[PDB]
Structures are given as C-alpha cells and as structure tokens.
Amino acid sequence: ASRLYTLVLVLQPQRVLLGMKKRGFGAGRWNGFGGKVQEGETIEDGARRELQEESGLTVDALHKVGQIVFEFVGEPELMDVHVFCTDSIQGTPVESDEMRPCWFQLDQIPFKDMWPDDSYWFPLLLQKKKFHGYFKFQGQDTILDYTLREVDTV
Numbered sequence: 526a527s528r529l530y531t532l533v534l535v536l537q538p539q540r541v542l543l544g545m546k547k548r549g550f551g552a553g554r555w556n557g558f559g560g561k562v563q564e565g566e567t568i569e570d571g572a573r574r575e576l577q578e579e580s581g582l583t584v585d586a587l588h589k590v591g592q593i594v595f596e597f598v599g600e601p602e603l604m605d606v607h608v609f610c611t612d613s614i615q616g617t618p619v620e621s622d623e624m625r626p627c628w629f630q631l632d633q634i635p636f637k638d639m640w641p642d643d644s645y646w647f648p649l650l651l652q653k654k655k656f657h658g659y660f661k662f663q664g665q666d667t668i669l670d671y672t673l674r675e676v677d678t679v
C-alpha cells in the first residue's frame with residue numbers, strides 16, 4: 526500500500542543544494558531532488574537518475590541515509606521515501622523550466638519555505654545520522670503526528 530520515492534541531497538561540508546519547484550508537486554518550496562522509481566530499476570539507480578535528470582549533476586557515490594513514510598489522511602497510497610546523500614558530484618546545477626537550484630550555507634537552510642517535516646529530519650541528515658521516520662499529514666502543511674528515530678542501518 527505504498528509507492529517508492531527517492532530524495533537526494535547534495536551535501537558539501539559548508540553548503541547544501543536545494544531546488545525550488547516552479548510548478549507541480551512541491552511548487553514554491555525548496556526540495557531535494559527525486560521522484561518515482563521505475564519498474565526493473567533499483568532504488569539507488571532511481572535516485573542517481575532522478576538527481577542527474579533534475580539537477581544536471583553527475584554523481585559518483587550515493588549513501589543511503591534514511592527512509593521516511595508519508596501518510597496523507599484520506600489518501601490510500603502511502604509515500605515510501607528513500608533518502609540519499611552525496612558529496613561527490615561533477616558539473617554545475619542547471620536551472621530549467623521546472624526547477625531552480627540554489628546552494629544554501631548550512632546556517633541559512635530556508636526551513637520556512639520547505640516542507641514541515643524537513644525541520645525534524647534535516648538536522649539529523651546534516652550531522653551524518655541515519656534515520657527512519659513516519660509522518661501523518663492533513664493537507665500539505667499540517668503534521669498530525671510523527672515518529673522519527675536514529676538507526677544504525679537504513
């Protein structure tokens with residue numbers, strides 16, 4: 526009863542890359558890069574493809590850092606989001622009709638213009654912790670309840 530999704534954060538020692546969606550899913554918020562996984566495609570392969578297609582970057586090594594399940598009250602399908610980190614990229618991010626990438630110093634993460642769950646798990650990602658999480662939403666701006674715990678293996 527869930528659909529697989531990937532989310533990739535390009536995290537360097539002093540900055541992180543986010544992209545502003547110009548429309549569709551996530552318009553007007555800063556997002557990591559990702560999307561649905563294809564049939565016959567592993568999750569790690571889906572994440573590499575999604576990062577490259579949406580940001581224009583080429584990634585060597587991806588590290589699995591978390592798994593987050595999203596429930597939207599009333600919607601049957603859960604979103605099972607597999608979160609990845611990387612610091613080994615080649616290229617320059619590309620702005621397209623769909624996405625506007627920007628680098629953010631770690632102290633200037635725009636949490637007020639991101640999703641409400643990001644304020645909870647993003648700090649774990651930034652200090653190299655792995656996590657498993659669950660968030661129940663009503664709409665897109667209200668967390669009804671949640672769980673989030675640090676783990677040794679994702």
Ligand SMILES: Nc1nc2ccccc2nc1N1CCCC1
Binds near residue numbers: 551666
């Ligand atoms: N992190 C996200 N939180 C959301 C909360 C409510 C509604 C939608 C959301 N989308 C998110 N992300 C976009 C790509 C994966 C994570």
